[PDB]
Design an enzyme around this catalytic site. Structure first.
Site: not given
Ligand SMILES: [Zn+2]
Ligand SMILES: [Zn+2]
Ligand SMILES: [Zn+2]
Lengths: 119, 65, 97, 49, 99, 92, 56, 56, 56, 149, 237
Positions: D3-5
């Site tokens: 998730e966008d990490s």
């Protein structure tokens, strides 16, 4: 409708009936002038307009780079050199009929197939 | 700032290889591709290390103190 | 990147230049006499009228191109509208072409 | 890295990857309250209140 | 800024000038620092940045019947600024960045 | 020399502009499938030519690699992160 | 590759399908829809083909 | 003291202003009772007026 | 300005012929960006509006 | 639609026609005020046929001629008589109304006042004709659509 | 110079299909709307046919003329230049009976506050009445569905006030306050020494606060004009 004004006044002419002879006259309301009417048509509304359709057809219309070109043969000189617009009477309901102006004779002709115009 | 000691990804020492990379380009007139190769920068991780580096130190040295 | 802003020019050398190239002053306008007349506007002032705008344009357009009229000055001719708008104006965003 | 990490190579970080400097400037002045009554830059100590 | 200082500034002075006492040519000096412990000296950008002063220059007008009007802050790299003329080596010397 | 002119939106209204010079100059008397689908130069009325289409972009968007290959708002987002970035802002 | 040829062709045939409707409305033949301008109706058909195209 | 009477109605209107303007400064079409600075003076109304006032 | 007047074509009114892979043309770029912007405005407006709606 | 009418498009077409708000203004091309002083003779050569017939099987010398559009009448499926009787019932015994037939090359309605400062009176009546008169359908109900749900 | 934005409207009263479609205008310091025609008579153009000629440039264009027939009648009650200036004068206020007051008040408005670009000089009526007619013509073109109603967001019709015009705004306001400072020292002269600070500090305040307004009492005054240069990336700068 034609727009006539009173001489020696240049003020606008208002209509008056010569009831004794049954005929239309135009009286000046600023002075004592009167004149017989030219036409019995006094007022006109015109809800569906066709004047403004070919607005600003200046002879320099050809010099407009922004305007597009066609190779359609003109009904007068059969020149394959034209410029075209559509609306000019910028109303919401107006049709997409194209108005072509000859880069030679400068006569206006439509792409209209349903209707059969002259100008 | 100044040529990093060792490539980030694999740790191959690219720190010494700077001055020679500048000579290969200037003096030897070689292209940036063959220069890095002659120096022995095989995999692209190290290639980027030198090829894409900006030696700003030279511009900071210019200021008087 | 290519944009600039019009800094502000003087319209006086353009008003002078216009009258000496065909501009009939507005005080001597007769609408029924000159009906096709092209309306000349400098910084949103109707200064008068001109009878052959095509030739006035070619002259103004190249005068500025030579560098005689400042290159930030705007000159438009809306043939359909029989109008010639000029801008010595400060503020206008311009781009090079 | 969901998730966008993202995951980062620590062995790369060690070698100085994405490492930055940071500076902050703190400022002061000896304000003059009226006349001859001035503030003083010194190492103060427990003297009265 | 260059169109303002060169032109617009002379125009503001000459429009509401004369009174019941008229104003003439306006001169715009280079950036300076009128400080105590001294009198005045030329102020360079890096100095002003550090010493929290305004990088402004003196405004002088000739009054008819010369006179100091105030201080106009100068835009860096503009006509009236010091860096405007300066070389790469001049800037590196001036502790100013060439970029 | 009058080879280049300055044009504002008001003046733009009375001109026609060619995108590329070459790609928008001769005429028709094979094609790469990999390349994009470009229009035409059928206009012979061309008054001006665009220096380079990429000059429609400002400082932030000019740093974006292949921005013609991204969904438009994604480009507008990187236009703001380019500010929350790090590096050398000056050498001094 | 051949699917890209097919796509290029689907957009191309949808482009001509629009022209046919554009020249049709330019000769006043194109009959306007109920409670819609000749333009409102022309555009509806155009925006329809250009979406049908993208979708296909 | 020496009441000029049409000056008493001037100082009365001033006390009427201040007491009104202490409770509400953001009054319908009137001058905001400005503080020395040019600041408007926080009325008590303004204090409890929601989003950030006492209540909200 | 890159177009002639009274041009109603897919190409003139904003149809993007290319994929994101092939990449957009300058006309395609701007037109997509125009429509794209309308999206961020709407989004920014829609959050404000729903903000209030939830609270009332 | 009513129970036993659901399939019939013609039943729907009828109700659509019975509720779709039509005004006199929508069918009119132009409103003209002529000076025709003889109720038995017309200065307009077109209308010369129209008088003969609406005079077989006192009036104002001022004519108010309305030209209606065939296509406009046909999209809103109207008759010259339909339109006529509507103008006739609006002013009642205050306006003398004559009209051409649905065959006549030009569709025209002629209006003369009944029984000083009279020309200005027709300008009032011409707006009450376009703006005020409702021809067919329920008011507010502007565009009516046909849906096969 | 000057810096005084006086806005003029030319309103076409009456909607689509409403009898008596009159054209009236909004003149500065004149409380009411005035019929176009009166303004033309006040400007000198007295015969309703010469007034017409300043609006419609074509005599074949009947459609635009029938549209002006009402306007003529609206103004018909005033017939000369003096009557027109008095009418406008009475609409301004001050109960100033009559010639040297009412009339001379209107005269001033038409010269100084009406169409203040063009010229503010005395004899320029031929110029201001021809321009008034241009507006009426443009108004009608749109009401006759010929010209498309002007776009408010066309960038060519927008200007960007930069670092110069913004300082020009301050300097003018500041020097005009310094002129008033000087005028107070000369009055006090019962018979040099001029406040240098006002200009120095005025500019300093504005460029610091970002409040484009004199000088601590900056509300309502433009906030966010002068911000501190973003210095993160060379690009961000
Ligand atoms: Zn007369
Ligand atoms: Zn021909
Ligand atoms: Zn490596």
């Amino acid at each position: 409708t034609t727009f006539r004004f009173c001489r020696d006044c240049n003020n606008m002419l208002y209509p008056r009936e010569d009831k004794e002879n049954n005929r239309l006259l135009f009286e000046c309301r600023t002075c004592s002038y009167v004149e017989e009417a030219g036409s019995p048509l006094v007022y006109r509304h015109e809800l569906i307009t066709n004047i403004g359709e070919t607005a600003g057809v200046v002879q320099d219309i050809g010099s407009d780079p922004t305007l597009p070109r066609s190779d359609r043969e003109c009904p007068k000189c059969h020149s394959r050199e034209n410029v075209f617009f559509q609306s000019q009477q910028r109303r919401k309901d107006t049709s997409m009929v194209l108005f072509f102006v000859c880069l030679s004779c400068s006569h206006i002709f439509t792409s209209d197939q349903k209707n059969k115009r002259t100008q | 700032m100044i040529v990093p000691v060792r490539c980030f990804s694999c740790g191959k020492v690219v720190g010494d290889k700077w001055e020679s990379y500048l000579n290969l380009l200037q003096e030897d007139e070689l292209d940036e591709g063959t220069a890095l190769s002659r120096l022995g920068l095989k995999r692209y991780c190290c290639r980027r290390m030198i090829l894409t580096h900006v030696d700003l130190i030279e511009k900071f040295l210019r200021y008087n103190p | 990147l290519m944009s600039c802003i019009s800094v502000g020019t003087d319209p006086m050398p353009i008003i002078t230049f216009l009258s000496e190239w065909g501009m009939e002053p507005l005080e001597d306008y007769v609408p029924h006499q000159s009906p096709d007349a092209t309306r000349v506007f400098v910084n949103g002032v109707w200064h008068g009228v001109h009878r052959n705008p095509a030739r006035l344009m070619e002259t103004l357009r190249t005068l500025r191109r030579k560098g005689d009229i400042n290159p930030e000055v705007s000159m438009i001719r809306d043939i359909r509208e029989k109008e010639l708008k000029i801008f010595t104006d400060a503020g206008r965003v311009y781009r090079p072409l | 890295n969901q998730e966008d990490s993202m995951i980062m190579n620590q062995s790369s970080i060690d070698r100085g990857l994405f490492r930055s400097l940071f500076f902050r400037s703190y400022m002061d002045q000896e304000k003059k309250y009226g006349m001859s009554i001035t503030e003083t830059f010194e190492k103060p100590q427990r003297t009265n209140t | 800024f260059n169109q303002f200082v060169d032109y617009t500034l002379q125009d503001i002075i000459c429009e509401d000038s004369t009174l019941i006492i008229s104003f003439g040519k306006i001169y715009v000096t280079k950036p300076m620092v009128n400080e105590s412990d001294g009198v005045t000296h030329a102020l360079y950008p890096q100095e002003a940045r550090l010493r929290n002063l305004t990088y402004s220059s003196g405004l002088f007008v000739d009054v008819k019947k010369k006179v100091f009007i105030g201080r106009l802050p100068i835009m860096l790299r503009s006509k009236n600024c010091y860096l405007s003329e300066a070389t790469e080596s001049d800037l590196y010397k001036l502790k100013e960045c060439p970029f | 020399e009058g080879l280049v002119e300055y044009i504002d939106a008001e003046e733009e209204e009375s001109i026609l502009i060619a995108m590329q010079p070459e790609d928008l100059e001769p005429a028709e008397a094979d094609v790469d499938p990999a390349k994009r689908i470009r229009v035409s130069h059928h206009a012979t009325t061309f008054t001006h030519c665009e220096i380079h289409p990429s000059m429609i972009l400002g400082v932030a968007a000019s740093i974006i690699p292949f921005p013609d290959h991204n969904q438009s708002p994604r480009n507008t987002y990187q236009s703001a992160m380019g500010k929350q970035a790090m590096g050398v802002f000056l050498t001094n | 590759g051949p699917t890209m040829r097919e796509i290029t062709e689907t957009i191309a045939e949808a482009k001509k399908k629009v022209l046919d409707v554009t020249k049709e409305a330019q000769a006043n033949l194109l009959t306007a829809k109920h409670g819609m301008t000749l333009r409102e109706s022309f555009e509806d058909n155009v925006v329809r083909f250009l979406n049908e195209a993208r979708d296909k | 003291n020496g009441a000029p009477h049409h000056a008493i109605e001037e100082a009365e209107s001033l006390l009427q202003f201040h007491v009104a303007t202490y409770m509400d400064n953001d009054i319908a079409g009137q001058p905001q009772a400005l503080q020395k600075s040019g600041r408007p003076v926080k009325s008590i109304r303004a204090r409890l007026k929601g989003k950030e006032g006492r209540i909200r | 300005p890159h177009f002639s007047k009274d041009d109603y074509s897919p190409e003139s009114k904003g149809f993007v012929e290319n994929s994101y892979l092939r990449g957009l043309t300058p006309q395609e770029f701007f037109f997509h960006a125009m429509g794209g912007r309308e999206g961020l405005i709407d989004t920014a407006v829609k959050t404000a509006e729903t903000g209030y709606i939830q609270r009332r | 639609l009513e129970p036993g009418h659901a399939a019939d498009q013609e039943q729907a077409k009828l109700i659509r026609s019975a509720i779709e708000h039509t005004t006199l203004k929508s069918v009119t091309i132009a409103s003209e005020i002529y000076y025709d002083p003889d109720p038995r003779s017309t200065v307009i050569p077109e209308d010369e046929e129209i008088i003969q017939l609406h005079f077989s099987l006192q009036q104002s010398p001022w004519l108010l001629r309305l030209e209606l559009d065939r296509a406009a009448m046909n999209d809103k499926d109207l008759t010259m008589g339909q339109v006529g009787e509507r103008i006739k019932q609006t002013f009642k015994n205050d306006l003398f109304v004559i009209w051409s037939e649905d065959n006549d090359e030009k569709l025209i309605i002629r209006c003369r006042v009944v029984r000083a400062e009279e020309d200005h009176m027709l300008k009032k009546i011409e707006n009450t004709m376009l703006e005020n008169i409702t021809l067919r359908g329920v008011e507010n109900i502007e565009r009516v659509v046909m849906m096969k749900y | 110079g000057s810096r005084f934005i006086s806005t003029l409207q030319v309103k076409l009263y009456g909607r689509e299909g409403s009898s008596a479609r009159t054209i009236k205008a909004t003149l500065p310091y004149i409380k009411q709307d005035i019929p176009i025609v009166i303004i033309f008579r006040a400007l000198g153009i007295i015969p309703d046919g010469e007034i017409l000629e300043h609006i419609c440039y074509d005599v074949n264009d009947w459609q635009m003329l029938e549209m002006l027939k009402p306007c003529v009648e609206d103004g018909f009650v005033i017939q000369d230049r003096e009557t027109a200036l008095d009418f406008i004068g009475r609409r301004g206020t001050a109960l100033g009976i009559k010639k040297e007051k009412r009339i001379q008040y209107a005269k001033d408005i038409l010269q100084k506050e009406f169409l203040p670009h063009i010229t503010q000089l005395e004899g320029f009526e031929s110029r201001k009445a021809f321009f008034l007619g241009y507006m009426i013509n443009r108004l009608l073109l749109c009401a006759l569905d010929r010209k498309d109603q002007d776009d408010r967001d066309h960038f060519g019709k927008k200007r960007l006030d930069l670092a110069g015009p913004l300082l020009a705004q301050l300097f003018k306001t500041l020097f005009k306050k310094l002129t008033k400072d000087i005028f107070r020292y000369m009055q006090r002269t019962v018979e040099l020494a001029i406040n240098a600070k006002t200009i120095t500090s005025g500019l300093k305040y504005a460029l610091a606060t970002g409040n484009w307004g004199e000088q601590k009492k900056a509300m309502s005054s433009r906030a966010g004009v002068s911000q501190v240069l973003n210095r993160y990336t060379y690009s961000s700068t």
